Every structure is written in C-alpha cells, then in structure tokens.
Amino acid sequence: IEDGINYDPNDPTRVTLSLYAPGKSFVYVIGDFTNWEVDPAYFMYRDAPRPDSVHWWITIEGLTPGQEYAFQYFIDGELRLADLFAHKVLDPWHDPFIPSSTYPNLKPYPTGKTEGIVAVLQPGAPQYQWQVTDFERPPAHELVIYELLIRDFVARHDYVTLIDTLDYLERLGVNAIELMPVAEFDGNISWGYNPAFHLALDKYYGPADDLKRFVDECHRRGIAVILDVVYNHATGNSPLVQLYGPTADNPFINIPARHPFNVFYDLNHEHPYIQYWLDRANRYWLEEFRVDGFRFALSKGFTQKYTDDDVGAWSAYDASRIRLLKRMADAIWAVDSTAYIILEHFADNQEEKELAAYGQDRGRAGMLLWHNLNRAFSQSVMGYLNDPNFSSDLTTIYYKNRGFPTPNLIAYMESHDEQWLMYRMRAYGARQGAYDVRSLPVALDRMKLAGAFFFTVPGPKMIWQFGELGYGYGERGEQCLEGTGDSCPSIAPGRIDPKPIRWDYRNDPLRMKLYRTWAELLRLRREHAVFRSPETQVRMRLQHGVPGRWISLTHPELSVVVVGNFGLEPLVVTPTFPQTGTWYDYFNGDSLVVDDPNTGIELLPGEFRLYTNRYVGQAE
Ligand SMILES: OC[C@H]1O[C@H](O[C@H]2[C@H](O)[C@@H](O)[C@@H](OC[C@H]3O[C@H](O[C@H]4[C@H](O)[C@@H](O)[C@H](O)O[C@@H]4CO)[C@H](O)[C@@H](O)[C@@H]3O[C@H]3O[C@H](CO)[C@@H](O)[C@H](O)[C@H]3O)O[C@@H]2CO)[C@H](O)[C@@H](O)[C@@H]1O
Ligand SMILES: OC[C@H]1O[C@H](O[C@H]2[C@H](O)[C@@H](O)[C@@H](O[C@H]3[C@H](O)[C@@H](O)[C@@H](O)O[C@@H]3CO)O[C@@H]2CO)[C@H](O)[C@@H](O)[C@@H]1O
Ligand SMILES: [Ca+2]
Ligand SMILES: [Mn+2]
Numbered sequence: 001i002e003d004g005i006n007y008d009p010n011d012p013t014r015v016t017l018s019l020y021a022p023g024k025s026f027v028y029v030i031g032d033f034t035n036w037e038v039d040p041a042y043f044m045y046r047d048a049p050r051p052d053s054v055h056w057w058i059t060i061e062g063l064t065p066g067q068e069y070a071f072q073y074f075i076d077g078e079l080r081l082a083d084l085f086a087h088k089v090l091d092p093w094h095d096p097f098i099p100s101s102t103y104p105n106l107k108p109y110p111t112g113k114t115e116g117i118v119a120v121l122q123p124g125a126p127q128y129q130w131q132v133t134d135f136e137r138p139p140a141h142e143l144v145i146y147e148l149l150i151r152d153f154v155a156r157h158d159y160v161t162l163i164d165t166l167d168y169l170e171r172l173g174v175n176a177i178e179l180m181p182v183a184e185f186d187g188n189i190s191w192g193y194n195p196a197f198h199l200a201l202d203k204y205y206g207p208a209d210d211l212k213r214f215v216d217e218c219h220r221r222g223i224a225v226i227l228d229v230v231y232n233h234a235t236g237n238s239p240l241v242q243l244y245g246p247t248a249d250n251p252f253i254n255i256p257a258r259h260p261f262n263v264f265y266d267l268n269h270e271h272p273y274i275q276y277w278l279d280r281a282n283r284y285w286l287e288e289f290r291v292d293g294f295r296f297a298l299s300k301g302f303t304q305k306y307t308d309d310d311v312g313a314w315s316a317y318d319a320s321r322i323r324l325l326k327r328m329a330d331a332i333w334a335v336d337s338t339a340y341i342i343l344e345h346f347a348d349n350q351e352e353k354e355l356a357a358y359g360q361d362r363g364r365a366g367m368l369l370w371h372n373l374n375r376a377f378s379q380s381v382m383g384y385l386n387d388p389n390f391s392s393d394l395t396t397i398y399y400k401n402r403g404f405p406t407p408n409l410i411a412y413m414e415s416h417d418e419q420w421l422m423y424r425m426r427a428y429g430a431r432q433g434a435y436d437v438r439s440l441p442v443a444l445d446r447m448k449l450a451g452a453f454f455f456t457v458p459g460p461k462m463i464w465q466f467g468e469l470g471y472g473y474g475e476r477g478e479q480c481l482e483g484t485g486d487s488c489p490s491i492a493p494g495r496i497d498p499k500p501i502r503w504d505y506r507n508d509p510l511r512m513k514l515y516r517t518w519a520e521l522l523r524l525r526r527e528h529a530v531f532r533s534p535e536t537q538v539r540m541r542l543q544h545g546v547p548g549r550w551i552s553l554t555h556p557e558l559s560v561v562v563v564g565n566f567g568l569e570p571l572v573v574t575p576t577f578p579q580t581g582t583w584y585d586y587f588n589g590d591s592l593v594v595d596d597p598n599t600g601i602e603l604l605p606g607e608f609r610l611y612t613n614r615y616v617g618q619a620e
Contacts, residue, residue, distance in 0.1 A: 004085025005121045012065035012124025018057040027056040031071025036113035065124030068107050084239040086119035094187050103203045128212040135219035137292045138175045140365035141407040142532050143460035146174040150205045152499045159210030173522025176224035186235045195230045196237040199284045224292035232301035233264040241265045259307045259314045269302045269324045279331040293340025317351045341367045356408035371409040374418035381446040383430030383437050386545050394542035399459045407459030414464035419484040420472025432568035435605045444470050445606040448517040449564050452608035455521040458536050468515045469505035520619040530555035548573035559613035565603035572600040583611035587619040
C-alpha cells in the first residue's frame with residue numbers, strides 16, 4: 001500500500017485509500033459512496049509505528065467497476081482534503097468554465113454536499129491501448145526541443161488539437177516537444193507554475209487518454225515528450241499546504257521561502273515525505289503517460305540553505321542542493337535509466353558541471369541544464385554588438401567554451417520566460433542607410449542568420465513556439481513579453497496573460513521562408529553527425545564587437561564552415577577554413593575556392609552562408 005488511491009488490479013469493486021498525517025486525531029472518508037455523509041463505516045484506521053510515521057487508511061468495497069467517485073478526507077471535523085496523490089480533481093470554482101468540447105461528459109461537482117476541491121477515483125477504469133512499441137528516444141545530447149504552451153499554441157488548448165500540429169512540428173525537424181506544465185494548477189488559464197495537485201492532469205487541456213494519444217503519436221514520428229514540472233513550491237490549494245495550513249507548524253513548507261524568486265509556498269526538499277512525494281510524482285508521470293523526461297522548473301530552489309533575497313548567494317555552489325538533485329536523479333533513473341533530467345537551474349558553473357557529470361561514469365547521460373543566450377542573440381540580431389551593458393558574445397553556445405567536457409547544455413535563443421527576438425528587432429533594431437533591422441523582411445532574414453549560428457552547433461537546443469514564423473511585435477507591438485526589462489507597449493498583454501495565436505503566419509511567404517530555413521538547417525543536423533557529435537572539432541569567431549562571425553566544424557563524415565554578417569553594411573568575413581580546396585554553398589548551390597585557409601567572403605548585412613568540404617546536395 002502507498003499513500004493515495006490504491007486500485008486492486010484484480011478487483012475493480014474496491015480501492016484502498018491512504019493519507020500521511022501525523023498530529024491528526026481522526027479521519028473519515030466522505031464522498032459519493034458515503035452520500036457525502038460522515039459514516040462510522042468510513043472511519044479510517046490509524047497506522048502509527050512512530051508519531052512522525054502516521055498513515056490513515058481504509059479499504060472501500062462495493063464500488064461499481066468503471067464508475068467515477070468524488071471524495072475527500074474529512075480530518076478532525078475541520079478540514080476537507082482532496083488526496084495529495086489524486087490523478088483527477090473536480091474544482092468547484094473553475095470546472096464550470098471548461099467547455100464540454102474540452103472535456104466531454106465531465107463529472108459534475110457535488111454542489112451543496114461538500115466544499116473545496118474533491119479527488120476522483122475510478123476503479124476498473126478503461127485503459128488506453130498504447131500503439132507504439134519500438135520508439136527509441138533521441139540521445140539526450142542530440143535533443144532539439146520545441147517548448148509549447150498548450151494554452152497559447154492552439155485556440156482549443158487541448159491534447160486532441162495538439163495531435164493535428166504534429167505534421168508542422170515534424171517537418172520543422174524538432175525531435176522533442178516540451179509541454180509547459182500540464183499538472184493540475186489553480187484555475188484554468190495559466191502558464192502552469194501555480195501547481196495544486198502535482199500528480200493530477202489539468203482538465204482545461206483535455207482528458208488523460210488524449211495526452212496518452214498525443215504521446216503515442218509523437219512516438220510514432222520519433223518525437224520525444226518532455227513535461228515541465230513544478231516542484232519548488234505548491235499553491236495554497238495543495239494538500240501539502242492545507243494539511244497543516246500556511247503555518248509555522250507545517251513541516252512541508254518554508255515561510256519565509258529559503259531563497260529568492262520563490263512564488264506560492266516554498267517546499268522543504270530535505271523533508272523525507274517531500275522526497276517520497278517527489279519520487280512518486282516523477283515515477284507516476286513516466287509510468288502513466290510514457291513521457292521521455294522532465295524539465296525541473298526552478299531546480300535551484302530545491303534547497304533549505306538560507307540565502308533570503310541574495311541571488312548571488314543563491315546561485316553559489318550548494319552541496320546540500322546538489323545532494324538533493326542527485327538523490328532525485330537516482331530515483332528517476334531507477335525507474336527509467338534513459339529518462340531526460342533537464343534542470344532550469346542557472347547556478348554557478350562549478351555546480352552545473354557536477355550535475356551534468358552525474359551518472360556519466362555509470363552509463364547515464366548526466367543531467368541537462370538550461371543555457372539562456374536570449375540576451376546575446378537579442379544584441380546580435382538587433383545589430384548592437386558594442387553595448388557595454390549587454391554582451392553580444394555567442395562563443396559560449398559551444399559547451400567546451402562554458403567549461404563543460406560533454407554536451408549537457410540546452411542552449412536557447414528564446415524561451416517562454418524571455419522576450420521574442422522579433423520584438424527586440426522590430427522595437428529597437430539598428431539601422432544604417434537603407435538597411436533597417438526594424439523592417440519585418442530584414443528581421444526575418446536575421447532570424448535565418450541566428451538559426452545558422454544556433455542549430456549548427458553540437459549539443460542540445462530548444463526553441464520557443466512560433467519563433468520559426470517570426471513571432472514577436474505583431475500588428476502594433478502587442479506581441480511583447482512584459483518583465484524582461486523592455487517597456488512593452490500599453491497594448492501588450494500582461495507577462496503571464498494569453499498571447500495572440502497567429503497560425504495565419506503560415507500563409508505569409510516571408511515568414512515561411514524563415515520556417516523552411518530552420519527546417520533545412522535541422523535536416524542538415526539530422527543527416528550529418530558533424531552538427532551533433534561530441535567528437536566534432538569546433539573553432540569559432542562569435543566574440544562581442546565582431547560583426548564578421550564564423551564557425552568551423554570538422555568530423556570524419558563532413559567539415560562545415562558557417563559565415564555570417566551581424567553588421568549593418570556589406571562586409572568581407574574571413575573564416576579560417578579547416579582545409580583548402582573547393583567548398584560547396586548548401587543554400588545557394590555555388591562553390592568557393594579556398595587556396596588560403598583564411599578566405600574572405602563578401603556578405604550582405606544579415607546574410608549567412610553554410611559551406612561543406614564535399615557536395616551533400618542543396619537546400620530545397
Ligand atoms: O490569478 C490570475 C492569473 O492567473 C494566471 O497566472 C498564473 C501564472 O500563469 C502561473 O505561471 C503562476 O505564475 C507564477 C510565476 O510564473 C512565471 O515564473 C515561472 C517561470 O516562467 C518558470 O520558467 C520558472 O521555472 O518558474 C517560475 C515560477 O517559479 C512568471 O515568470 C512569473 O511572473 C509568475 O509570477 C507571478 O505570479 C506570482 C504568484 O502569484 C506573483 O507573486 C509574482 O510576483 C508574479 O510575477 O501563477 C499565476 C497566478 O498567480 C494567468 O496566467 C494570468 O493571466 C491571470 O491574471
Ligand atoms: O543610444 C545609443 C545606444 O545604442 C545601443 O543601445 C541599444 C541596446 O544595445 C539594445 O539593447 C536596445 O536597448 C533596449 C533594451 O534591449 C531593452 O531591454 C530596454 O532596456 O530598452 C532599450 C531601448 O531603450 O537598443 C539600444 C538602442 O536604442 C548601443 O549598444 C549603446 O551602447 C548606445 O548607448
Ligand atoms: Ca486547474
Ligand atoms: Mn525552494
């Protein structure tokens with residue numbers, strides 16, 4: 001028996017319920033099967049081998065196979081608690097706003113019979129029949145991740161509609177989709193970082209069997225699914241907060257929070273029960289939904305070290321935090337030894353290297369770390385390469401330039417937390433004579449240039465929905481993310497508010513040229529190990545204040561030189577080619593004779609070229 005809702009795989013008429021709650025006096029289960037009455041038949045047993053090891057349990061018999069039943073734990077005659085480990089809840093405040101087209105035949109809340117969120121159990125639930133048997137998840141260091149917010153990716157905000165986008169995403173060339181948080185969050189409209197029931201699937205994105213269908217369809221196409229998951233904190237509607245209240249006596253939480261950038265109730269990751277709950281949650285999402293791994297939101301928050309409001313002190317090497325993340329990783333990898341462990345960390349490099357290295361001596365991939373290059377790419381595509389406050393240096397895109405021995409950094413130009421590059425170019429872009437980065441066609445060309453200096457570099461990569469169509473700025477500047485330092489127009493939505501959905505951008509040939517350029521770069525990357533391999537030898541000229549930029553890659557199967565003009569006027573850019581001879585322009589189909597490794601190439605502002613040391617075809 002574990003805490004939560006324990007089905008009997010051989011008896012669909014019963015369930016065993018178990019709650020961890022030291023310090024309580026008595027518990028009744030109330031629910032549909034008690035007619036929401038307090039009944040002595042539903043008085044829970046107290047199992048208390050030690051005062052800090054108290055579990056309340058009962059076996060409920062005589063249920064109808066396949067029927068849903070709402071229930072709560074009614075504790076001490078004063079607290080009505082939905083199970084911490086519920087996989088579905090009914091929310092009386094927000095469920096009325098979920099269309100039947102989003103969640104067909106949604107069980108009505110027991111209005112007037114109880115109050116607060118209720119848990120749902122369903123013995124003998126019909127089982128989704130998984131179709132894909134032989135899916136091989138991409139190597140962790142080869143991930144090309146599409147970060148997706150279901151709320152703002154499709155107007156219907158649901159799993160069944162996501163399935164209809166997979167031809168578009170597969171053609172773009174990503175090999176993983178990262179869903180922003182799908183676990184039950186307060187309300188319906190959210191980015192998802194207000195989790196209430198961390199093992200329940202939020203019903204506003206549709207039923208669980210539709211997420212299973214989505215994962216199965218991704219797997220059919222060779223695409224992994226990563227879940228963004230939020231374990232730093234819990235809202236006031238979490239049973240971790242409600243069981244003892246937001247009080248000094250609640251051992252699960254920290255008030256005040258132990259570190260900066262906390263929201264809601266900071267959790268105590270040193271508490272053995274929080275470790276149990278975390279492990280249960282990671283195991284559940286892997287086992288039930290067959291997802292390929294997790295992006296751990298605010299993993300730097302997994303510590304009891306007190307740094308108050310000191311971000312520098314928080315980001316410093318924290319041995320306690322490293323222990324807790326290795327402990328969590330051991331439990332994940334005991335469930336599934338190749339599950340992705342992705343940290344949204346932003347700790348000092350000493351700590352990040354140690355987390356990346358963990359398990360590699362035992363055949364594990366190590367942990368992957370978010371690597372934010374939004375500001376450096378922003379400066380680079382805006383055409384401001386000499387700002388003393390905002391570096392344009394892209395050198396650290398390659399893992400060895402960040403001091404890492406292995407490709408465990410997920411670089412991104414964009415994430416849901418960062419400004420759109422297209423906003424920055426259209427809002428602030430540089431100009432010289434006739435060349436204006438604020439002009440939409442010029443800005444789209446600079447995103448092609450940015451892609452050529454991003455998708456070509458070994459190690460995993462992430463892109464944020466619709467960057468490939470030039471999302472940002474929009475009609476008048478409304479496509480602007482608040483809270484990045486930029487003063488968004490008055491017409492922009494709030495940072496966390498719904499953003500415009502613009503699939504009509506597929507009908508703009510200029511925006512589709514950007515999509516097709518990124519798709520062609522990702523096809524090159526898929527087809528040629530040079531772009532992906534930890535054995536690739538990399539040289540680069542991506543420094544701050546250098547407009548004439550280049551990357552060289554050498555590998556046994558292919559050598560590559562990427563050249564780009566991040567300036568505002570025509571420029572001769574002189575890469576060091578790794579070998580003399582004839583090189584082949586992949587996009588333009590022409591040749592380049594290199595008889596001096598230092599060969600100058602005149603480029604228009606915003607232009608890139610990609611050369612290979614042998615003919616490998618042409619962009620379509
Ligand atoms: O209540 C009405 C509002 O509800 C919704 O808003 C939600 C929001 O969608 C949800 O994410 C959550 O916001 C918390 C913070 O989320 C983000 O930060 C996370 C990062 O994006 C993520 O990458 C990282 O891993 O984790 C971060 C959280 O630790 C935003 O960047 C923050 O701005 C959000 O904070 C805001 O809310 C908090 C707490 O309420 C507030 O203290 C903070 O100062 C704010 O800055 O919770 C929100 C509800 O509170 C809906 O989306 C809104 O449109 C609606 O008005
Ligand atoms: O005024 C001359 C000024 O030009 C250049 O500065 C540019 C910045 O480099 C660039 O980031 C952008 O600044 C915006 C920030 O990105 C944004 O986050 C917010 O802070 O608003 C800024 C615009 O006000 O654009 C400016 C040019 O306007 C150059 O690099 C500077 O050295 C120089 O002083
Ligand atoms: Ca919800
Ligand atoms: Mn924390």
